[PDB]
Curated annotation (Swiss-Prot), chain A:
Residues 1-154 form the Peptidase S7 domain. It is found in: Host cytoplasm; Host endoplasmic reticulum membrane. It is a peripheral membrane protein. Forms a heterodimer with NS2B. Interacts with NS4B. Interacts with unphosphorylated RNA-directed RNA polymerase NS5; this interaction stimulates RNA-directed RNA polymerase NS5 guanylyltransferase activity. Interacts with non-structural protein 2A. Interacts with host SHFL; this interaction promotes NS3 degradation via a lysosome-dependent pathway. Interacts with host CEP63; this interaction disorganizes the centrosome and inhibits host innate immune response. This is Serine protease NS3. Displays three enzymatic activities: serine protease, NTPase and RNA helicase. NS3 serine protease, in association with NS2B, performs its autocleavage and cleaves the polyprotein at dibasic sites in the cytoplasm: C-prM, NS2A-NS2B, NS2B-NS3, NS3-NS4A, NS4A-2K and NS4B-NS5. NS3 RNA helicase binds RNA and unwinds dsRNA in the 3' to 5' direction. Leads to translation arrest when expressed ex vivo. Disrupts host centrosome organization in a CEP63-dependent manner to degrade host TBK1 and inhibits innate immune response. Inhibits the integrated stress response (ISR) in the infected cell. The active site is at residues 35, 59, 119. The chain holds residues 1515 to 1668 of 3419 of the full protein. Acetylated by host KAT5. Acetylation modulates NS3 RNA-binding and unwinding activities and plays an important positive role for viral replication.
Length: 154, 40
């Protein structure tokens, strides 16, 4: 129920299901963006995953334990978005990150546009480590999107 | 509201992948609610 991998985050009512996000299972902890779940409990197979930690400002939340993803973008190399869009197979998209320049340091950022329910898709370095999650970003003048490479503290 | 997860794949790097997108350098601010904004 906690096997490592990338997962879709779904909701079901009285009809079909909707994909609201994506997350990463690593070391028995599920990692996703706060705006995907709002810290609601997650059903996994027969079991239940409970929120352990989160921070609305980082837009992150973990389940079952503390945040485990500590890999950092090197500021130099290309990365891969492992995009898991609603209703589509997981696909790797390679890109050279731009940068969000903030008063509190620079954050790598990827100029890739996907549906809202792709939120929480992991961003990878060349060794396959997750250097952050996709889906909290900005819209620029031409209407395209730039996502921060959002990474938590371990 | 049944919120649940389902596996979508293994987390691996894809050899010979599509390289795309630009690399913008943007001045941004982050508020306490987790929203980025562009600096004018
Ligand atoms: N708008 C474009 N081009 N792309 C977005 C990509 C969304 C990726 C996943 N992340 C989110 O859903 C977060 C949630 C909220 C997190 C909050 N802390 N959200 C966002 O970061 C932004 C934030 C934001 C809104 N305003 C701003 C102004 C300045 C700076 C930042 C922002 N929120 C939006 O982007 C909301 C929005 C605003 C305007 C229009 C649309 C959505 C409608 N677009 C879509 O329906 C899809 C369309 C793509 C589908 C795949 C093919 C390419 C197109 N794209 C999109 O929905």
């Amino acid at each position: 129920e906690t096997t490592d991998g990338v997962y879709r985050v779904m909701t079901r009512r009285l009809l079909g299901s909707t994909q609201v996000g994506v997350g990463v299972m690593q070391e028995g902890v599920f990692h996703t963006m706060w705006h995907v779940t709002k810290g609601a409990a997650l059903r996994s197979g027969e079991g239940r995953l409970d929120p352990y930690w989160g921070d609305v400002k980082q837009d992150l939340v973990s389940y079952c334990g503390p945040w485990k993803l500590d890999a950092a973008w090197d500021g130099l190399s290309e990365v891969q978005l492992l995009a898991v869009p609603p209703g589509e197979r997981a696909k790797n998209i390679q890109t050279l990150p731009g940068i969000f320049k903030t008063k509190d340091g620079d954050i790598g950022a990827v100029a890739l546009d996907y549906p809202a329910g792709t939120s929480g898709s992991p961003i990878l370095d060349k060794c396959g480590r997750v250097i952050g999650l996709y889906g909290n970003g900005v819209v620029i003048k031409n209407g395209s999107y730039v996502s921060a490479i959002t990474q938590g503290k371990r | 509201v049944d919120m649940y997860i389902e596996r979508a794949g293994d987390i691996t790097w894809e050899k010979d992948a599509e390289v795309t997108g630009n690399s913008p350098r943007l001045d941004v601010a982050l508020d306490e609610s987790g929203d980025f904004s562009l600096v004018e």
